[PDB]
């Protein structure tokens, strides 16, 4: 099957019927972190959450960052947006961080207890009316009900394709955000400015010339 290295041997824990059918399996565990199946279940969940919040974050970087080079949406840089936003806001940042810690803690603890038991949040009485729509959809990490409003998860023949598009765009958005961080430290300009500088002179403006990434040259 498909692998991250054609020719390397696939590890025995990623070549099982419980692992081959997950999403985006390419036999990539050179550190052997997923040998414990409970650990692989937990790491599947951590990967899905990092994928989804990395896509949402990198979209919040790029689409305001692309449209600010167009006409509308005078938006500051992402390493400057929190300061301008807290100058425009109504609350200090500590109060807003406390509110988001309570609001995220409730939701994350719901997801926590649904990881610990799959049939957990469907207790009758536990919720006013959201208790019957807070179960899973037989595959943990992929909930239904109020999550997924448009009903696209219902169709079974598209479903592995939807999963694999999600995991590829998510891993790619994780690389995008780590590149946003490193590009921010090495250059000091925005990522669209880095893309414009690589398009203006590709053979002279890259990470071999920034003087930071490999300083032995």
């Amino acid at each position: 099957r498909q692998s991250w290295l054609p020719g390397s041997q696939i590890p025995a824990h990623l070549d099982t019927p419980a692992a081959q059918a997950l999403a985006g399996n390419f036999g990539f565990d050179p550190l052997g972190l997923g040998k414990d199946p409970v650990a692989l279940r937990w790491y599947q969940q951590a990967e899905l959450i990092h994928c989804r919040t990395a896509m949402a974050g990198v979209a919040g970087i790029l689409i305001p960052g692309l449209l600010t080079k167009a006409g509308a949406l005078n938006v500051p840089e992402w390493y400057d947006a929190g300061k301008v936003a807290i100058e425009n806001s109504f609350a200090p940042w500590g109060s807003l961080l406390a509110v988001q810690l309570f609001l995220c803690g409730f939701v994350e603890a719901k997801r926590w207890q649904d990881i610990r038991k799959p049939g957990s949040q469907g207790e009758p009485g536990s919720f006013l009316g959201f208790e019957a729509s807070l179960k899973g959809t037989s595959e943990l990490g992929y909930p239904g009900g109020p999550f997924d409003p448009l009903g696209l998860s219902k169709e079974a023949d598209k479903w592995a394709d939807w999963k694999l598009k999600e995991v590829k765009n998510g891993r790619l958005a994780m690389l995008a955000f780590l590149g946003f961080v490193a590009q921010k430290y090495a250059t000091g300009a925005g990522p669209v400015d880095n893309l414009a500088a690589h398009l203006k002179d590709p053979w002279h403006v890259n990470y071999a010339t920034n003087g930071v990434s490999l300083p032995f040259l």
Partner: protein, 165 residues
């Protein structure tokens, strides 16, 4: 600042010690030729001395009443006053590399106990298995907490004890 310590860029005994070391090096320098190898060696020594004092004054170190850098070992006080790079980041760097070494040794022991000659692998090292475990040991904290949570990190009370236990 912390504990009545002045910053080293503000301390006067720090500059006095810098000037005293440059004075000793130039008193050793002034008895040679201009472009000779002892002169080049002492000028490189003076260059490293000036660079070291500039780097210590740059990093925000705290000097005392004698002009020497003092370190702060309290997580919250150093994270508050910007001294986290002297104990806190070094202690987590050390715990990473020390647990690396310990986890690679533990995996080598458990790998060689399952053979017909565990002692013979302890005297004569299985180099490919040692290099495989050495490369795989970069995810040692994750594997350590996973072996902790499964109960396979510990041996039970099948251990060796004395007659009064």
């Amino acid at each position: 600042d912390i504990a009545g310590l002045t910053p080293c860029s503000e301390s006067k005994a720090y500059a006095k010690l810098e000037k005293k070391e440059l004075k000793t090096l130039e008193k050793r320098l002034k008895q040679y030729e201009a472009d000779s190898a002892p002169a080049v060696a002492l000028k490189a020594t003076m260059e490293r001395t000036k660079a070291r004092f500039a780097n210590y004054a740059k990093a925000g170190l705290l000097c005392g009443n004698d002009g020497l850098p003092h370190l702060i070992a309290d997580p919250g006080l150093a994270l508050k006053y910007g001294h986290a790079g002297e104990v806190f980041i070094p202690t987590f760097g050390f715990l990473y590399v020390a647990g690396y070494i310990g986890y690679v040794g533990r995996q080598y022991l458990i790998a060689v106990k399952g053979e017909a000659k565990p002692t013979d692998k302890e005297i004569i090292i299985d180099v490919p298995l040692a290099t495989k475990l050495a490369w795989q040991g970069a995810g040692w904290p994750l594997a350590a907490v996973q072996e902790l949570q499964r109960g396979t990190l510990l041996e039970k009370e099948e251990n060796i004890t004395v007659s009064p236990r």
